[PDB]
Structure 1
Amino acid sequence: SMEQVAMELRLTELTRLLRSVLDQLQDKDPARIFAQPVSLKEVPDYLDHIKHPMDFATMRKRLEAQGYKNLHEFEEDFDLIIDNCMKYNARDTVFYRAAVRLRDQGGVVLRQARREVDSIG
């Protein structure tokens, strides 16, 4: 149907916007602490601590399959990256600190993304 196509164009355009959001958030992680999944070879107990691991590469795979239906779903995954790290790692660590700085800097980007998603529809 023509409606299904229109919906698909909306999803494509959301994907375009979330791709730009993802690039902007990942620039706020210049150390690449959050770039890839925590290695279960190197942290074998990880899944005992963290039930829903997340990282920027995993989000990008979902994004490119157009697997984010709305901004809320995308923000959920970004919040998992931060929150997982802040639980597994102690306050005094470069990992925790990196997550705090990514949360604070990402807030700005996400605030305007929300306006753009509502604005453009």
Structure 2
Amino acid sequence: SMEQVAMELRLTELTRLLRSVLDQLQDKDPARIFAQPVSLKEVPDYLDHIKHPMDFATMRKRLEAQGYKNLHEFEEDFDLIIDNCMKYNARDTVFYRAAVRLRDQGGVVLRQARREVDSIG
């Protein structure tokens, strides 16, 4: 149907917008602390603490599979990256502090993304 194609075009475009957001958010992590899953080889007990791990590579995988249906689902995953890190790591660590900075600097990007999604539809 022509309708299904139109939906696919929108989802493709949402994916295009979300890819730009993802790139902008990952740019705020030059230390690449959040680039990859927390290694279960280095942190064997990680899953005893964190029940839903997340990272930018995992987000990117879901993104290119067009697995984000709206901005809210994308934001939930971003929030997981930050919130997991701020629970697993203590307040006076490079890890916790990086998450705080990512959350603060990411808010600006996400603020405009929300306006743009509504605006463009």
* TM-score, structure 2 as length reference: 1.00
SS in 1 for 2:91: coil
SS in 2 for 1:54: coil
Deviations 1:16-72 (A, max 9, x none): 000000000000001000000000010000000000000000000000000000000
Distance of 1:118 and 1:55 partners within structure 2: 26
* Same amino acid, percent of matched pairs: 100
Q: After TM superposition, what 4+ stretches of structure 1 lie above 3 angstroms from structure 2?
A: none
Distance of 1:51 and 1:13 partners within structure 2: 31
* Gaps in structure 1 of 5+ consecutive residues: none
* TM-score, structure 1 as length reference: 1.00
Alignment RMSD: 0.2
SS in 1 for 2:34: coil
Deviations 1:63-105 (A, max 9, x none): 0000000000000000000000000000000000000000000
Count of equivalent residues = 121
SS in 1 for 2:19: helix
